[PDB]
Amino acid sequence: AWITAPVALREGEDLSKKNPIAKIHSDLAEERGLKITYKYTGKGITEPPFGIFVFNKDTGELNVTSILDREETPFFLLTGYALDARGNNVEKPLELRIKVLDINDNEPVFTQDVFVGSVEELSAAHTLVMKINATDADEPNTLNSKISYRIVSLEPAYPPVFYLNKDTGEIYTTSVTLDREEHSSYTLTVEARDGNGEVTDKPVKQAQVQIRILDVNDNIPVVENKVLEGMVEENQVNVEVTRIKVFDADEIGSDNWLANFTFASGNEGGYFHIETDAQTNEGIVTLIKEVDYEEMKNLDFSVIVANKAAFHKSIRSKYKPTPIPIKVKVKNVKEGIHFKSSVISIYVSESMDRSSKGQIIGNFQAFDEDTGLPAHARYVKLEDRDNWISVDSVTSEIKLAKLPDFESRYVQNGTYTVKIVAISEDYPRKTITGTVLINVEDINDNCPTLIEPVQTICHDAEYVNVTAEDLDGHPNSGPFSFSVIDKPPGMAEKWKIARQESTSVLLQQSEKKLGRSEIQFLISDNQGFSCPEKQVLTLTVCECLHGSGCREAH
Amino acid sequence: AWITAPVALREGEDLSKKNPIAKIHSDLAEERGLKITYKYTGKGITEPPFGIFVFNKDTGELNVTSILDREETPFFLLTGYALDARGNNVEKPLELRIKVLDINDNEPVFTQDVFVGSVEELSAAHTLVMKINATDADEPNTLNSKISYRIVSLEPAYPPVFYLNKDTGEIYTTSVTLDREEHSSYTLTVEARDGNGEVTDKPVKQAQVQIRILDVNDNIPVVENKVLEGMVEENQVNVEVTRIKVFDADEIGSDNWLANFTFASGNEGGYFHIETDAQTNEGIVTLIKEVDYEEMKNLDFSVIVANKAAFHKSIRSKYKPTPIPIKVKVKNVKEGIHFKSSVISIYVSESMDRSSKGQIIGNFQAFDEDTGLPAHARYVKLEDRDNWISVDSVTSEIKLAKLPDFESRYVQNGTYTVKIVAISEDYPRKTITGTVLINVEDINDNCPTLIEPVQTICHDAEYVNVTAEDLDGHPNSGPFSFSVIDKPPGMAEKWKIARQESTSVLLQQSEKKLGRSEIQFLISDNQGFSCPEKQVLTLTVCECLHGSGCREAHHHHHH
Numbered sequence A: 001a002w003i004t005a006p007v008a009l010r011e012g013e014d015l016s017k018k019n020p021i022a023k024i025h026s027d028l029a030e031e032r033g034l035k036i037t038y039k040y041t042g043k044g045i046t047e048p049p050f051g052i053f054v055f056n057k058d059t060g061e062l063n064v065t066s067i068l069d070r071e072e073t074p075f076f077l078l079t080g081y082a083l084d085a086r087g088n089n090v091e092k093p094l095e096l097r098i099k100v101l102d103i104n105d106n107e108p109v110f111t112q113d114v115f116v117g118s119v120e121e122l123s124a125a126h127t128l129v130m131k132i133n134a135t136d137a138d139e140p141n142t143l144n145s146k147i148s149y150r151i152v153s154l155e156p157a158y159p160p161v162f163y164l165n166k167d168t169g170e171i172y173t174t175s176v177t178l179d180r181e182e183h184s185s186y187t188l189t190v191e192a193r194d195g196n197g198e199v200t201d202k203p204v205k206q207a208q209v210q211i212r213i214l215d216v217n218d219n220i221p222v223v224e225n226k227v228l229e230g231m232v233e234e235n236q237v238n239v240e241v242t243r244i245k246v247f248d249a250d251e252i253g254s255d256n257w258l259a260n261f262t263f264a265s266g267n268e269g270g271y272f273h274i275e276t277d278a279q280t281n282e283g284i285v286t287l288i289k290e291v292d293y294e295e296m297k298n299l300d301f302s303v304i305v306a307n308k309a310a311f312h313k314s315i316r317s318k319y320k321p322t323p324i325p326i327k328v329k330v331k332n333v334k335e336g337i338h339f340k341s342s343v344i345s346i347y348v349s350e351s352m353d354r355s356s357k358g359q360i361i362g363n364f365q366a367f368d369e370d371t372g373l374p375a376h377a378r379y380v381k382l383e384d385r386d387n388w389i390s391v392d393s394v395t396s397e398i399k400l401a402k403l404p405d406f407e408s409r410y411v412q413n414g415t416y417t418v419k420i421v422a423i424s425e426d427y428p429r430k431t432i433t434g435t436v437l438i439n440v441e442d443i444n445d446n447c448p449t450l451i452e453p454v455q456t457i458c459h460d461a462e463y464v465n466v467t468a469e470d471l472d473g474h475p476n477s478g479p480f481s482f483s484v485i486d487k488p489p490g491m492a493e494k495w496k497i498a499r500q501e502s503t504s505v506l507l508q509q510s511e512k513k514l515g516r517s518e519i520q521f522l523i524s525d526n527q528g529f530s531c532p533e534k535q536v537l538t539l540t541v542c543e544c545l546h547g548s549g550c551r552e553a554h
Numbered sequence B: 001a002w003i004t005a006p007v008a009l010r011e012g013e014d015l016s017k018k019n020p021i022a023k024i025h026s027d028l029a030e031e032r033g034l035k036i037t038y039k040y041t042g043k044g045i046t047e048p049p050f051g052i053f054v055f056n057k058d059t060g061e062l063n064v065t066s067i068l069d070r071e072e073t074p075f076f077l078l079t080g081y082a083l084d085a086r087g088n089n090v091e092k093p094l095e096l097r098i099k100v101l102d103i104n105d106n107e108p109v110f111t112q113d114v115f116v117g118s119v120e121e122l123s124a125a126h127t128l129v130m131k132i133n134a135t136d137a138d139e140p141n142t143l144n145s146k147i148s149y150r151i152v153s154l155e156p157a158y159p160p161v162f163y164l165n166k167d168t169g170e171i172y173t174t175s176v177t178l179d180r181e182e183h184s185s186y187t188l189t190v191e192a193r194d195g196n197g198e199v200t201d202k203p204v205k206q207a208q209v210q211i212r213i214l215d216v217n218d219n220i221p222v223v224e225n226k227v228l229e230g231m232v233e234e235n236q237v238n239v240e241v242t243r244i245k246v247f248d249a250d251e252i253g254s255d256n257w258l259a260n261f262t263f264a265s266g267n268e269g270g271y272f273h274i275e276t277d278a279q280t281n282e283g284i285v286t287l288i289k290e291v292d293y294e295e296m297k298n299l300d301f302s303v304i305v306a307n308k309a310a311f312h313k314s315i316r317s318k319y320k321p322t323p324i325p326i327k328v329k330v331k332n333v334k335e336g337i338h339f340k341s342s343v344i345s346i347y348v349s350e351s352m353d354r355s356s357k358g359q360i361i362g363n364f365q366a367f368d369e370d371t372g373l374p375a376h377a378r379y380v381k382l383e384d385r386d387n388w389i390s391v392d393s394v395t396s397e398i399k400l401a402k403l404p405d406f407e408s409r410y411v412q413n414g415t416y417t418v419k420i421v422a423i424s425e426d427y428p429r430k431t432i433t434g435t436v437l438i439n440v441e442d443i444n445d446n447c448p449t450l451i452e453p454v455q456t457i458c459h460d461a462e463y464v465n466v467t468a469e470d471l472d473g474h475p476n477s478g479p480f481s482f483s484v485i486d487k488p489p490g491m492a493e494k495w496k497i498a499r500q501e502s503t504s505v506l507l508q509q510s511e512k513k514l515g516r517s518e519i520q521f522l523i524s525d526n527q528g529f530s531c532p533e534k535q536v537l538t539l540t541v542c543e544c545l546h547g548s549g550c551r552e553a554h555h556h557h558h559h
């Protein structure tokens, strides 16, 4: 059938000047002579929003009542009827579309009053940072809804490092590089415009953007101290040598900023310890060992600075680790007298051919440690158990009082020890102790003698144990060599040697007669030496009844 | 079916921005996937005026091409079609009316540059004088065509005595009464306006109307204040006596203004005739009968004045006829001698016993008409055929010259007529004639005599007719009495009276022989008189030849 021409009406205006906007009518009223009542139905009449359209039952004319708004109603598809007096259709109901024409009656508005994004420092060009957005409620795919995003102002404005795509709202990084040390945070006011995106004096909606620039370790540390010299006193420990103040441009607090240290050379002795003070970013070096001013050790050392986190690839190999030298000066302190060595060893001999009672054999001179010169003092002897030595009270010269005896009970590991003290003149009177190590030469002045030359065994005895004693130390005692001699003749076969050891021997009589024998030995040193005295063993073999010692009278 | 809502377009305007003004379409194209072509027909496309609308065969859109003028085309009733490729209908053709909206783009204009109308004087209020008209070609029954008639300027502007209905254009009279004697014609300029009848500085078309106030006789005539005496002469006729001048306020020339006259008293004799002069409005009185100064010296009379037309009902019962005095005196004229009567009667007799030859028997005295006295004149006889009279030239005395005879052939009806003339002395000779009628007494002096005493009849005749003659007038002639007398004896018995007429008689003789006879009569008068002479009839009976005359010889004198 025929399509009824649709009606066009503009939004947001009074349309009373266009009424009636439409009129339906049947030719069955005049030609066929029937009273027909017209009525419409549809959105705006029988459906919401109500009270938009009204109609005359008799004429069939249409009427606009209110102002249309296409943002709420894009079109009205209402239908007209022609009814008889009863209420039935005399004509097939027609559809009449009413199109509402768009007008640009609402501005683009941002989804947020404030946008926030972040981008890393030294980012490549055209790196997407973030994206802003807005919406326009007007007719889609028309200039009334085409948004154009623009940058109003910027901080710190110059230079420009952000490009705002006006069509997409995307923000990119430009070809100018970002440097956080130049500008950490960018705050930016944007704008959204309607139509053709033409900048006019019209006040349009605007939001703000806040971009935070992230940090990278692209700045090498630098020492700020003018004078770099350490300072410690003598005989001190756990003291502050120096504080190495270092500057770093990167983000304060971060591992990209935190100073970090390593000894290059000079601390092989382990005299220093270094650690970074994270609050002042100072390298704290301290003494972990006492130093003697007089020994005059050079404690100078060198150190290398870097960041706790590695350097950015952007700056690597542009960095050469150059060791930073640090001289350290030491303070002298009045210490008073001392000995050039706490212990001294003087070597003496047991023989008279070199050692003699009353010969000088050394001194224990006390020096003033500060000036290193000999100081006037009063020396005194100490703990001389067997009175081997004499100490002069003034000159400190030491001389023997006896001939040393290596075999003495007071000698241990071949040494005879003696303490001595020295006292200074004037105040404050200081007392220092010394030690002398008297190493006595062991000479072979002892020969192997029997400890039990006379003894008496049982008849059931299995063997006899002969044992010797040479008080001499190695090698002047060592293993003995035993030798039983044939005196009287035949006896050498009567008394055999079964087993021998280093200082003893086992002896077995073959025939096993019961009586006393005089058995001479020649027991010789490891050097071959032997006693002038004859080593004789008087052994009496007795008849032992079990339990008892020896038989009686019978 | 559904009637398509018509589309409206304003005339006298460019409609390009409104195109396409309309569009038809079928849903059979989209649903059925068929190629359809649309087309329109009607006034503006296929009928004149042409090329006003054009249409797109494919879309079905309509367009207007030129500027419209609804005064030429009020609307366009065209019809749309939907056709397939073959050329047949896929939809019922719909009617699509295109209405043209009016604009007030032409002004009201009068049917004529000038109107003329008429209204009678002192007409009642709201009397329709006339009607003016104007036309507006714009849409009927709209303010664009509602005309408003108004009076621009009137002369005399004041007072307002005309009301012009702005809606109808009709002109009426107001309660202020019109007086044509004050103002005869109103010339009047009117105007016609468009819209709601609002008077603006806009130049609108204007016309002029001319109104004539027609006259009515509502003003009574008035005569001058002088006495109007007149004077005519004696023996004059058809002469102007006087001119009665009369004034009248009504329309000059009209019968409401024309003086009119009726005689009140003094013209019973029919001596005067009056007729009004239409140019001067004067009453022209003229003498239509001669007057005698000796008999009448004054001819005074009266007339009353009115109008030729009747007075208007408004002014009637206010008019009171006042007779106008007209003294007119007659002037004497020398008329000279005259007779106190043109005719005289004189009685005379035929007998000598009273009338005598030479006796005075009357006079014909001439009098001087002016003085009434007897005047000296010379009198003379006239037409006296038989000389019966002598008239004295000096004294006018009349006397016989002969004895009058009643039987005279010159006498007629017993009267004898004779004229007389009198001539005056001094200059000029006036001559007057008189008449004297002389009546004569008839006396019995004639006797009945026979006219033919000698006769000759035939023997075939059975009677003979004898006749007498008495020349006297009645009664002295009258009937006769005849008597045949016995002389000689015997005659009386043979000649017998058969029958007698008044003046004659016939006789029959018994014997009737052939010969002459002597028959004596005594014929007596009606008075008894008879002739002194013997009255004898000599009758000769002759043979006759049964035809006529006497047959034989001597009875003829000669032949």
Ligand SMILES: *[C@@H]1O[C@H](CO[C@@H]2O[C@@H](C)[C@@H](O)[C@@H](O)[C@@H]2O)[C@@H](O[C@@H]2O[C@H](CO)[C@@H](O[C@@H]3O[C@H](CO)[C@@H](O)[C@H](O)[C@@H]3O)[C@H](O)[C@H]2NC(C)=O)[C@H](O)[C@H]1NC(C)=O
Pocket: A465, A466, A467, A499, A500, A501, A504, A505, A506
């Ligand atoms: C034959 O005789 C020697 C000599 O000793 C005598 O007889 C022994 C049985 C012991 O009673 C001795 O006290 C006595 O002098 C035997 O002695 C051996 O040597 C010494 C003691 O003589 C022992 O040496 C050791 O010393 C270390 C520290 O220096 C200790 O920790 C040990 O406890 C021990 O004292 C050694 O033990 C001892 N030998 C033994 C007991 O077998 C010797 O052994 C005996 N036989 C032979 C074949 O000569």
Ligand SMILES: *[C@@H]1O[C@H](CO)[C@@H](O[C@@H]2O[C@H](CO)[C@@H](O[C@@H]3O[C@H](CO)[C@@H](O)[C@H](O)[C@@H]3O)[C@H](O)[C@H]2NC(C)=O)[C@H](O)[C@H]1NC(C)=O
Pocket: A016, A018, A019, A020, A054, A056, A061, A062, A063, A064
């Ligand atoms: C529907 O809308 C139509 C169009 O606006 C309205 O119809 C028209 O209404 C006006 C206003 O009453 C009428 O004109 C008026 O005339 C009066 C006096 O005649 C005058 O005082 C006003 O200033 C105005 O000029 C007009 O005749 C009428 N019809 C048409 C065809 O225009 C109507 O009021 C609306 N309502 C309904 C119920 O349809």
Ligand SMILES: *[C@@H]1O[C@H](CO)[C@@H](O[C@@H]2O[C@H](CO)[C@@H](O[C@@H]3O[C@H](CO)[C@@H](O)[C@H](O)[C@@H]3O)[C@H](O)[C@H]2NC(C)=O)[C@H](O)[C@H]1NC(C)=O
Pocket: A111, A131, A133, A134, A135
């Ligand atoms: C920029 O703003 C736009 C517009 O707001 C965001 O786009 C989003 O578009 C979605 C479509 O997915 C819309 O929400 C959706 O509605 C449809 C039907 O109307 C529904 O089917 C989906 O389930 C969803 O609800 C919406 O218009 C819109 N979102 C908002 C919050 O408005 C876009 O995400 C924004 N950009 C950024 C970076 O936030």
Ligand SMILES: *[C@@H]1O[C@H](CO)[C@@H](O[C@@H]2O[C@H](CO)[C@@H](O[C@@H]3O[C@H](CO)[C@@H](O)[C@H](O)[C@@H]3O)[C@H](O)[C@H]2NC(C)=O)[C@H](O)[C@H]1NC(C)=O
Pocket: B111, B115, B130, B131, B132, B133, B134
């Ligand atoms: C404007 O219309 C008027 C009135 O309708 C016409 O003029 C007047 O018309 C009347 C009616 O005819 C005239 O009266 C008489 O008309 C009859 C027709 O039956 C005619 O036979 C008579 O002789 C007489 O004319 C009237 O006189 C006439 N006059 C005037 C001054 O209007 C006319 O159509 C238009 N205007 C004019 C001014 O004519």
Ligand SMILES: *[C@@H]1O[C@H](CO)[C@@H](O[C@@H]2O[C@H](CO)[C@@H](O)[C@H](O)[C@H]2NC(C)=O)[C@H](O)[C@H]1NC(C)=O
Pocket: B018, B019, B020, B054, B062, B063
């Ligand atoms: C019918 O009316 C339309 C206007 O609605 C005319 O169309 C335009 O004509 C002008 C001049 O040629 C141009 O703008 C375009 O060619 C047409 N369309 C548009 C959208 O502008 C059309 O000319 C009219 N009459 C015809 C076609 O005969």
Ligand SMILES: *[C@@H]1O[C@H](CO)[C@@H](O[C@@H]2O[C@H](CO)[C@@H](O)[C@H](O)[C@H]2NC(C)=O)[C@H](O)[C@H]1NC(C)=O
Pocket: B260, B261, B262, B274, B275, B276, B307, B308
């Ligand atoms: C003036 O008007 C009078 C009255 O209208 C006229 O009078 C009549 O004249 C006729 C004709 O002879 C007589 O029969 C009537 O008797 C008259 N009537 C009256 C009332 O007098 C008169 O003729 C007019 N006179 C003139 C000269 O115009």
Ligand SMILES: *[C@@H]1O[C@H](CO)[C@@H](O[C@@H]2O[C@H](CO)[C@@H](O)[C@H](O)[C@H]2NC(C)=O)[C@H](O)[C@H]1NC(C)=O
Pocket: B465, B466, B467, B499, B500, B501, B502, B504, B505, B506
């Ligand atoms: C005698 O003759 C005369 C004339 O010839 C006649 O007289 C007649 O008288 C009558 C009166 O009765 C008159 O009319 C005339 O005088 C005569 N007759 C006429 C005119 O016809 C008459 O005929 C004779 N008389 C008689 C017969 O008695």
Ligand SMILES: *[C@@H]1O[C@H](CO)[C@@H](O)[C@H](O)[C@H]1NC(C)=O
Pocket: A260, A261, A262, A306, A308
């Ligand atoms: C920083 O300290 C690290 C351990 O945290 C240690 O290896 C060195 O002293 C410094 N730097 C590097 C790279 O090792």
Ligand SMILES: *[C@@H]1O[C@H](CO)[C@@H](O)[C@H](O)[C@H]1NC(C)=O
Pocket: A413
């Ligand atoms: C000194 O002697 C004892 C016994 O001879 C021995 O065990 C010790 O090892 C020696 N001292 C040292 C340091 O060896």
Ligand SMILES: *[C@@H]1O[C@H](CO)[C@@H](O)[C@H](O)[C@H]1NC(C)=O
Pocket: B412, B413
């Ligand atoms: C005579 O008088 C008579 C009678 O009236 C008349 O008939 C006749 O005409 C008159 N004739 C003459 C001449 O007088």
Ligand SMILES: *[C@H]1O[C@H](CO)[C@@H](O)[C@H](O)[C@@H]1O
Pocket: A423, A429, A430, A431, A432
């Ligand atoms: C150290 O030795 C003695 C005691 O140990 C003191 O008396 C002396 O003066 C020195 O200070």
Ligand SMILES: *[C@H]1O[C@H](CO)[C@@H](O)[C@H](O)[C@@H]1O
Pocket: A419, A421, A431, A432, A433, A434
């Ligand atoms: C060394 O020796 C004695 C102890 O034997 C100390 O008391 C003295 O002061 C010195 O330091």
Ligand SMILES: *[C@H]1O[C@H](CO)[C@@H](O)[C@H](O)[C@@H]1O
Pocket: A342, A343, A419, A433, A434, A435, A436
């Ligand atoms: C020798 O040894 C003593 C302790 O036995 C020390 O105190 C002294 O200083 C010396 O070195």
Ligand SMILES: *[C@H]1O[C@H](CO)[C@@H](O)[C@H](O)[C@@H]1O
Pocket: B423, B428, B429, B430, B431, B432
């Ligand atoms: C009238 O009559 C005669 C004519 O007969 C005139 O001549 C005479 O003069 C008188 O006037």
Ligand SMILES: *[C@H]1O[C@H](CO)[C@@H](O)[C@H](O)[C@@H]1O
Pocket: B421, B431, B432, B433, B434
């Ligand atoms: C009367 O008679 C004669 C003629 O009859 C006139 O001519 C004369 O004037 C007189 O008046």
Ligand SMILES: *[C@H]1O[C@H](CO)[C@@H](O)[C@H](O)[C@@H]1O
Pocket: B342, B343, B433, B434, B435, B436
């Ligand atoms: C007598 O008769 C004559 C005519 O017969 C008149 O004219 C004359 O005036 C007189 O009256």
